[model samples]
Target: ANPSDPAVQRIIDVTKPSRSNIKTTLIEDVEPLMHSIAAGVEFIEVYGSDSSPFPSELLDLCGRQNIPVRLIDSSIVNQLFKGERKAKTFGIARVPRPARFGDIASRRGDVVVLDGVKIVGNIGAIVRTSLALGASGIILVDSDITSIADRRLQRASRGYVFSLPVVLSGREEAIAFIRDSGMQLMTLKADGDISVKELGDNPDRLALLFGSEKGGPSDLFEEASSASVSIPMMSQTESLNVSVSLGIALHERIDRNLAAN
Candidate 1:
């Protein structure tokens, strides 16, 4: 005879779970909010004084969802920056553990392979760029994504991890997949045969390979590749950073796809 249930059913049934009534939010920026919201964040706060240059429409949407906005002065920003620097320096290791291939492939996009990139900043920056410029995904070879590495990567990515997929694979497995997909596998070597611009003609499905900071992809020169492409350099600079070179190469290769409806 409970009023919460019908007379035929003596037991009371709750309309919704208690957890559904509880909501939580993490404050960052608008783009990161989109990623964080998908990762179960219910609200985000943005700084008022700092010109972040995010879309106004997104902020409106957040308002409708009852997310609060916190505007802080430049002092707060400086404090956060100092805290982050200390954390990066003291809390991180020189090298990270290996990444998983399955995780990267799970997110939909073009694949970027990183070959033993020791610097966490470089790896993280590449991951951020891959998300920004619409690459399919990323693969880290012989590199680790431990807690410290992840923090650096996530900070660089601006919490885009929820929005993108990242994979870690060995040389054999990554190469095998690239071969099987029939995608062009090109290394951005200094003495490569073709230039990046000309090489994009036949690359429908492409896997761009980049070596670590200390080494060039010399081992891959004699190995069978779909093609090898190089970037033109000027002045005394022998070559570009792997992350910068890959960005330029991938951006040009995928430029055509940008126009596609």
Candidate 2:
């Protein structure tokens, strides 16, 4: 996450708009679009309207990449985005190749293992949040999610999908890897006995596991995890969105780490 690190800078530079590379796709989703820029997708241009001022982060990212931002009329916006009301900003960028699972594993840090999460948007959101929260990488265990190019996922991630370390593995392979890596595995569940807030910070390598919204954590995780953790909530809501739950769990770890230090 250090700004000066070459990896971080690569993300900034690679995503910059360049005319030399024209093989681009039209990105309308805001979050993924911004991430596209961060991940070094060759940006062609950015479109926006008067009422919708481009966010500062967008400007900063574009400015860093030296990509031009153009102000367009709503008609043009509607034409480009197929009459989507939320199409406030759009960017054209080259299609990105998917990162290999091995590439993600090489970089060591806290890992989040998502089990059977079928929703693309949720995956995207989790990726964005994981990177922001400083998770080492993410492992999708037996996921049905699509490539990062999926528009909904990209939009939900605001384009951060490409900037983080991510890989896919089968359930057994993923569990074996987590155990082999010497990282403690913890599952987040509604009926978990340990409170997330009370799970004190531990410096040991860690992997947090989350299950799909439709069916909670897989039996594999339930049996394999070192501990089962839960976020205490008012009894009203039965559960939280997977992405939302991840953010809270990661933040708790981060908070605990900060306090411990």
Candidate 3:
């Protein structure tokens, strides 16, 4: 593929810029692209390599959709994406509309509420873990995850950030969601009155609250959260990484959720 070719240039034109809308985003990795295809989000075009054939699952997903996956030279993969590892498969897709607070409000599963967890990489990690744990959705309070085009966030989440509705909202409004949505608000803290199992027994919908390590749980959650829960600690560790704590919390609660449901 010629770099000067209009189509190649178009992908570069759209992706090279640091900021843009979800009008188009490079599906930098194949696995993430698979989720998009499965979710029924349309693709503008898909470019892959003859040497790096896309998996049969993805090929059939795209093929069934009548979206042809175009092949490019293996070298072009590097030309298209910038990262430590070269991309064998990558392409552009129209970003579906972002998840909104209302979407989470109406959903019927557990939700992860993140407050003041502002780092892009950290946000992605949390989002990925939440996705794996069968959580209903995510509400990112006062977070900066504004665009699907943010490559750092896309990379950090290993491309699964878009797999769920990760909505961004304010602290007060988030508190309101817990109230209006009628979901139990369970906040995770180093010292809390309840254990994960006690919180997990909630048959009603739940919203697990996680806060930034530096900031801890803000005073708002002190009132908003119906129950404060803690993971048992054996050692003298002050805290775990915010995402790590979430993983432990979700696996304990959500895995049980999966078993019963």
- Candidate 3 residues lying further than 4 Å off, grouped into runs, are 1-9, 16-22, 145-148, 235-237, 256-261
State which candidate, 2 or 3, has the greater lDDT: 3
Model 1 per-residue lDDT tens digits across residues 6-92: 342211011111222112212234565555444334332333324234357555655676654443334433444344431110010
Question: Cα deviation of 175 in candidate 3 (Å)?
Answer: 1.9
Candidate 1 wrongly placed segments (more than 4 Å): 1-27, 35-56, 59-109, 147-149, 213-215, 218-224, 235-237, 259-261
Residue-level lDDT of model 3, residues 1-261, one tens digit each, is 343356644664566456565577776668778876765567877767666656777778788888867777656656555665666776677777877777665555788988888888888888788877877688887776676547788778887777777787778888887898778888888776788757566777778898896347687688877887888788424677889989988887775547534
The TM-score leader among the candidates is 3
Instruction: Compose the digit string of candidate 2's lDDT tens values, residues 154-227.
Output: 55766666666567678888888888777789988877878888655566767899998635778867667899
| Global lDDT of each candidate | 0.55, 0.70, 0.74
lDDT score for residue 45 of model 3:
75
RMSD of each: 11.7, 8.5, 2.9
User: What number of clashing residue pairs does each candidate have, in the order they appear?
Assistant: 9, 9, 0
Error of 2 at 225 (Å): 2.3
Better of 1 and 3 by lDDT: 3
